[PDB]
Structure 1
Amino acid sequence: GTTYCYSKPDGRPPSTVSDPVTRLGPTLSRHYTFKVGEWPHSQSHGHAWICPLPSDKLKKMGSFHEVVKAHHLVKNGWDVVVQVNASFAHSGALCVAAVPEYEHTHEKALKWSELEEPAYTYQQLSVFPHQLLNLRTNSSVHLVMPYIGPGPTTNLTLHNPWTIVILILSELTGPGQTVPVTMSVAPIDAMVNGPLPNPE
């Protein structure tokens, strides 16, 4: 099933640049697929994998990557699909969400990592565009977020608006092994500004 982050993505071009605008064909902003982590039997609830998009992992988008390198700003959504792998003997659930200006991160900003939320948060995480991954029901959370932020577009090198939380609700109960989480980000409606110079 497909769940939308506040609204379908707009291919509108930035209300704040008289500067020339390169739109990114899918074939440039292609698709990317990596493993988040291995949800283990010990990690008590309140845990989570922070995936602030896209940075840290931006070095690895090797094409989309490339154009955002030599360009000052970008506006883009995200088709993102988190995929836990587990059998029918495992129990537990997570809740993975897209969060607007998420922050806590102990300033390990724009670096994916792992944390334990304060609780009032995991309790109310669901107050954001999120989906449930319930080990006796499904094995996939699917979301699509639109460009968002104070500016009508930003610098992905300084700001990451979207950030996926992958929260542990009910601990992993079942067979001794771990359950590998995974995620496919692929940029939607990409658009660049100001080419920067040559790396010399």
Structure 2
Amino acid sequence: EACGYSDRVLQLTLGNSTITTQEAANSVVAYGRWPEYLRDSEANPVDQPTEPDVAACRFYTLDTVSWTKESRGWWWKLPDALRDMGLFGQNMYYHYLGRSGYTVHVQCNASKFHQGALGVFAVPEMCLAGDSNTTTMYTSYQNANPGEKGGTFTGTFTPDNNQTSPARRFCPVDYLLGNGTLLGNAFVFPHQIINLRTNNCATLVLPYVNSLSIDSMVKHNNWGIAILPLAPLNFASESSPEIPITLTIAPMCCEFNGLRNITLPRLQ
């Protein structure tokens, strides 16, 4: 635009929160569908829904992780990563049912002299593979759900050989996208790439996706966020560079049904 508007410079405002960026690579709307509230013709639970609106549909920043030459990748699940985030988390644990869309904003700046590229993927039903070759489908609820800290990918599959006290955790191998399919094909999922010379962030607007209009947020994650180094971090001639990666995520058009007493999960 001759008034200066740019593909690269954006402002997102949800609730009492605003994100600015000056080095964006446009932004993605997954499957071309913007988030929406549940329509009457698709509705299923009959009780009046709660719609917390600005109290929950706002940007929550998770703990910042660190990208280094040895990093194999990171993953998070939604809504799990937001289970402890203000009134969104509260609404989630107080209700049997809940649905939500999200704006995901991944942040990672560096310099004109650094290089590297992060693949940022939003995967519907991101089922990951377990650490076991003695029992399949054995990852425990506690290990499947890290909350905001997320998990990581590994370059090596290593089977849990403790049969007495199994680890019961995932063992997500990076080139196999943590799920037995090739990473080079993850681009069929809604994605952006943070290539440090080009941009310093990724923005993905995710609709609620499921085979149901609404479901148990506590039992089921709708989306997975997978961040993998497609091209490794590098800087000048330093052997041990580091740059931070920050995740900020906002729920959108979230509504809840089936109010009762609060859920108190076994998370450890």
- The equivalent residue for 1:193 is 257
- The equivalent residue for 1:63 is 87
How many Å apart are 1:36 and its aligned residue? 4.4
Among candidates 57, 62, 65, match of residue 34 of structure 1: 62
CA contact (8 A) 2:56 2:251 kept: no
- The equivalent residue for 2:43 is 15
How many Å apart are 1:76 and its aligned residue? 0.8
- Determine the C-alpha separation between the residues in 1 that align with 2:27 and 2:82: 24
Pairwise CA RMSD = 2.0
More deviation, 146-155/110-119: 110-119
More deviation, 106-115/165-174: 106-115
How many Å apart are 1:155 and its aligned residue? 0.9
Among candidates 22, 29, 35, match of residue 4 of structure 1: 29
Among candidates 144, 147, 153, match of residue 109 of structure 1: 144
Determine if the alignment matches structure 1 residue 125 to structure 2 residue 182.
no
Q: 1:37 to 1:144 in 2, by over 3 A?
A: same
SS of the equivalent of 1:124 reads helix
Determine if the alignment matches structure 1 residue 173 to structure 2 residue 234.
yes
Determine if the alignment matches structure 1 residue 153 to structure 2 residue 214.
yes
- The equivalent residue for 1:144 is 205
CA contact (8 A) 1:35 1:181 kept: no
- Determine the C-alpha separation between the residues in 1 that align with 2:151 and 2:263: 30
- The equivalent residue for 2:78 is 53
Determine if the alignment matches structure 1 residue 92 to structure 2 residue 116.
yes
Aligned length: 196
Query: Normalization by structure 1: what TM-score?
Result: 0.89
How many Å apart are 1:85 and its aligned residue? 2.7
Query: Which residue identity lines up with residue 184 of structure 1 in the other structure?
Result: T
Identity %: 31
Query: Which residue identity lines up with residue 255 of structure 2 in the other structure?
Result: M
- Determine the C-alpha separation between the residues in 2 that align with 1:96 and 1:195: 35
CA contact (8 A) 1:36 1:49 kept: no
CA contact (8 A) 1:35 1:180 kept: no
CA contact (8 A) 2:55 2:87 kept: no
SS of the equivalent of 1:151 reads coil
- The equivalent residue for 2:156 is none
Query: Which residue identity lines up with residue 37 of structure 1 in the other structure?
Result: V
CA contact (8 A) 1:50 1:166 kept: yes
CA contact (8 A) 1:30 1:64 kept: no
Query: Which residue identity lines up with residue 50 of structure 1 in the other structure?
Result: W
- Determine the C-alpha separation between the residues in 1 that align with 2:214 and 2:78: 14
Unaligned runs of 5+ in 2: 1-25, 131-138, 154-172
- Determine the C-alpha separation between the residues in 1 that align with 2:36 and 2:220: 20
CA contact (8 A) 2:104 2:249 kept: yes
Query: Normalization by structure 2: what TM-score?
Result: 0.68
How many Å apart are 1:110 and its aligned residue? 2.6
How many Å apart are 1:56 and its aligned residue? 4.8
- Determine the C-alpha separation between the residues in 1 that align with 2:145 and 2:65: 17
Q: Which of the two has higher C-alpha Rg?
A: 2
Structure 1 runs, 4 residues or longer, greater than 6 Å off: none
